[PDB]
Amino acid sequence: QWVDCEFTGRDFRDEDLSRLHTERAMFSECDFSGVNLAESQHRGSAFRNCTFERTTLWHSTFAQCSMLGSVFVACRLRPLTLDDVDFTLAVLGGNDLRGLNLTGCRLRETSLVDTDLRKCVLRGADLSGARTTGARLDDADLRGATVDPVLWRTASLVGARVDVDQAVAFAAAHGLCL
Amino acid sequence: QWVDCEFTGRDFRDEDLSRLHTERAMFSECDFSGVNLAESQHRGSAFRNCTFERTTLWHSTFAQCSMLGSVFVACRLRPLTLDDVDFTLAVLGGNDLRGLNLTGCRLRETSLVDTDLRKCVLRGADLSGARTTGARLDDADLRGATVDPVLWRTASLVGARVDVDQAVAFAAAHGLCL
Ligand SMILES: [Cs+]
Ligand SMILES: [Cs+]
Ligand SMILES: [Cs+]
Ligand SMILES: [Cs+]
Ligand SMILES: [Cs+]
Ligand SMILES: [Cs+]
Ligand SMILES: [Cs+]
Ligand SMILES: [Cs+]
Ligand SMILES: [Cs+]
Ligand SMILES: [Cs+]
Ligand SMILES: [Cs+]
Ligand SMILES: [Cs+]
Description:
The structure is a homodimer of 178-residue chains.
Chain A: E1 2-8, E2 21-28, E3 41-43, E4 46-48, E5 51-53, E6 60-63, E7 71-73, E8 80-83, H1 164-173
Parallel strand pairs in A: 1-2, 2-3, 2-4, 3-6, 5-7, 6-8
Organism (chains A, B): Mycobacterium tuberculosis (strain CDC 1551 / Oshkosh)
GO molecular function, one term (chains A, B): protein homodimerization activity
Protein name (chains A, B): Pentapeptide repeat family protein
């Protein structure tokens, strides 16, 4: 258990940190490449501008945690239990996030380039400023999520679930004039 | 002036009928191929299942007239003054109708295949059952018009003006789930 402490510029590479429990641990610029972090549990922690390359995070829990600015490259992120996790400014490009429940999660200015979010639950999520080029949102649930008009012409949306507002914004994003 | 009379299966081909005035003239199955009908004026008349091939109808006026079932092939239809003209079941495929004001006109089960309706005013029009394959509705005004979901994936709509309902139906026609 790492409780009420910080870690800055620490190199945790290729370590086995499975089942780690943290509470109010603030990590800044820590390197978690090749780290095995399966079955870990986090509550109130922050992983700020950290590097997650090929990090294994599946079967984990993050509650009220921040991931602001962190970069995730080819990470195993499913399944995963998230409750109010801030992904603002984070880089999730190219990862497979299919099926993850991301209700009300902040993804402001998050990079979602070529990220697979198929069937993801994004109700009430905030995607203001996210980069969605090549993003796959098929069969995902977006109702009440705040999204920019650019998303409507960048992500694939077959079967995506939306509210009236989004449908209207989709329509205007494809050249119709309201 | 042809007033309160009928004409059935009449052959009017290649006749000069320019400036003709009719009032409650009922034409059924009349052939108007190659006919010049420019500057004509019609009020309360019917042109039912008539044939209009290469007929010249520009600079004309039709008020409360019916065109039910008539076939129009390469006709000059612009400009034109229409007020409540019924085009139900009519064949307007391939004609250039650009810019025509068609407010509240019925186009139920009308064939609009490859018809150019760019910039047309179709407010309050009824297009239930129209066939819109290759139809061009760019910069046209559709607000309050009743249209089938199939129109949203068949006609070109760049800049078309729509209300909230149509935008929503456009959205659902492209795979989004409301
Ligand atoms: Cs361990
Ligand atoms: Cs802090
Ligand atoms: Cs949860
Ligand atoms: Cs969640
Ligand atoms: Cs916003
Ligand atoms: Cs911003
Ligand atoms: Cs004449
Ligand atoms: Cs009649
Ligand atoms: Cs008129
Ligand atoms: Cs009109
Ligand atoms: Cs209808
Ligand atoms: Cs019908």
